Design a protein around this ligand. Sequence first.
Ligand SMILES: *CC(=O)NCCNC(=O)CCNC(=O)[C@H](O)C(C)(C)COP(*)(=O)O
Length: 287
Amino acid sequence: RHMKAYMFPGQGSQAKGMGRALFDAFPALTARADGVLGYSIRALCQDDPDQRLSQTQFTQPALYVVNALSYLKRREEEAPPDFLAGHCLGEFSALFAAGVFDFETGLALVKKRGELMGDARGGGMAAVIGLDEERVRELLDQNGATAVDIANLNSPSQVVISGAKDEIARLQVPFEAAGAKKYTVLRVSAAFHSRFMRPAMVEFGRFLEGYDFAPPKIPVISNVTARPCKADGIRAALSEQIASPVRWCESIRYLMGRGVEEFVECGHGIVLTGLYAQIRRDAQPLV
Ligand SMILES: *CC(=O)NCCNC(=O)CCNC(=O)[C@H](O)C(C)(C)COP(*)(=O)O
């Protein structure tokens, strides 16, 4: 028994085949998911018909389901974590785990979230390796890209930028020329976690008015503030998260400052495990 945090992945971590043993182990919750969604979560995750997993309207419920079942499996065999943190979409899984809403309610929110984000066009995003936050901001401004945002601050050397599709394409060469060790235009049609998501944020906040949320029973480290979610204004903060940078790196350093000894990724893949290792390594001098 150690102080621990669970970390839940978001968009970009999904894969064809995710969740297989989990669906078999949780037939009853799989059925309830299928009832909220109106289609088979298992078929979506295991057969990826029409590569729907890459389409945000479907990606989001897919991640929610596999994350939530990964959580409940884990909870069969161990005590609950001391802290919770969800990366991007995964913030919904942390809130579920914290009892802010129940399984199916959260699934309903994510379904709506995915439909709203699915209507966004004209946007793009790129992952950049090798440049810190400050250097990224200065290169954006120096290239005239004032309407491009830093969407994810993932680790000391990994950020994700987010803005108009043509602008993200055209920034590649200049970032490469200025030292970006890698620059990859992502297969998204929206500028997620940028100010351009304001329309989605406002509509989402309106949609959330019809829901009631409980204060978290276990602290959830917000993507927006890098600090525990407050016991209220949770609806406001979840809507804001859509259009705000994801302060992941700082969230993780916070949890380490708070005494966390063990960091466990719940959900498909090793995206957050790898980021955690980068963050921890950067704080630890080599021998
Ligand atoms: C969290 C968020 O805003 N999600 C939607 C945007 N992100 C993606 O679509 C995934 C972009 N890819 C990455 O940031 C990196 O490739 C990973 C997944 C962090 C893995 O590291 P790598 O390939 O070095």
